Design a protein around this ligand. Structure first.
Ligand SMILES: C[C@H]1CN(C(=O)CC#N)[C@]12CCN(c1ncnc3[nH]ccc13)C2
Length: 289
């Protein structure tokens, strides 16, 4: 089905929350005999008309995307009175990549991490071909379909580029993931496929740190930033990035991967590699392990 009856979506548990949305595990059980399939259902919480209109666009974006590396749209569910719109997606029980890395570091090696990186990259290349900027590319928004298959799986901040420009200025309520954001996103609120490339470099750092919280992007940058009176956190972050400071090479991270990170973190967006150019290099590295 593409329209799911709200009364047949049986709530099981929370799967996650981010920005202004929440995703819940539900069994779509039309017969009520508890035989239906599990689905992931996203909805808004503490949201006004602005966020509701944004959520409708999020649905239309995900509905239009068709990639082995992008979570599958299944349909929508309209609450009573068509007042609480819900987005129904395939449920990937292995969960998000961040949690997966923190649980299974011992049995994951560089080749497997490079495979994930390659698949994320191909997903992002596809998004770019649809003129879609993700704006929230991070390990917490990647799902594990299987041991050797990941998917980009949250689009709460995603935007479609205008037809006349390859960038988009976005100023919206909520806390930004500033430690994944390129300098032009931090300062000018500009987002593009090349600002996503910056975030992808941070994702590479996350994967080869196994999303260890002690050396996460926030922990690392916050140590570099320090704390100065009348110097807001955003300014200190912009300052250290302009000075050339970057997240460090994760221990045991292959030198080639660290080089790619640094290229993704070029100061100016036009100087960063495209996802189309990163892909073949990641495939080569995964073939060399
Ligand atoms: C991808 C991350 C981001 N997030 C949020 O909930 C963020 C918000 N709001 C999840 C946590 C785990 N999630 C899922 N887990 C299993 N299958 C799934 N299918 C569709 C989604 C989904 C979603």
């Amino acid at each position: 089905p593409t329209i799911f009856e709200e009364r047949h979506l049986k709530y099981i548990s929370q799967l996650g929350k981010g920005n202004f949305g929440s995703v819940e595990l539900c069994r779509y059980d039309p017969l009520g005999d508890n035989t239906g399939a599990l689905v992931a259902v996203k909805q808004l919480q503490h949201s006004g008309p602005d966020q509701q209109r944004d959520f409708q666009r999020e649905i239309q974006i995900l509905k239009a995307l068709h990639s082995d590396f992008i979570v599958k749209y299944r349909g929508v569910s309209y609450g009573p009175g068509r007042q609480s719109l819900r987005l129904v997606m395939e449920y990937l029980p292995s969960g998000c990549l961040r949690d997966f890395l923190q649980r299974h570091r011992a049995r994951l090696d560089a080749s497997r991490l490079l495979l994930y990186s390659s698949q994320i990259c191909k997903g992002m290349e596809y998004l770019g071909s649809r003129r879609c900027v993700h704006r929230d590319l991070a390990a917490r928004n990647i799902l594990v379909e299987s041991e050797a298959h990941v998917k980009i799986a949250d689009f709460g901040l995603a935007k479609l580029l205008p037809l006349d420009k390859d960038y988009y200025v976005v100023r919206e309520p909520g806390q930004s993931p500033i430690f994944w954001y390129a300098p032009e996103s931090l300062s000018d609120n500009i987002f593009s496929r090349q600002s996503d490339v910056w975030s992808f470099g941070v994702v590479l750092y996350e994967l080869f740190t196994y999303c260890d919280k002690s050396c996460s992007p926030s922990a690392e940058f916050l140590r570099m930033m320090g704390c100065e009176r009348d110097v807001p956190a955003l300014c200190r972050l912009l300052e250290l990035l302009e000075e050339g400071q970057r997240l460090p090479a994760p221990p045991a991270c292959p030198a080639e991967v660290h080089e790619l990170m640094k290229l993704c973190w070029a100061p100016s967006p036009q100087d960063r590699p495209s996802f189309s150019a990163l892909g073949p290099q990641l495939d080569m590295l995964w073939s060399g392990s």
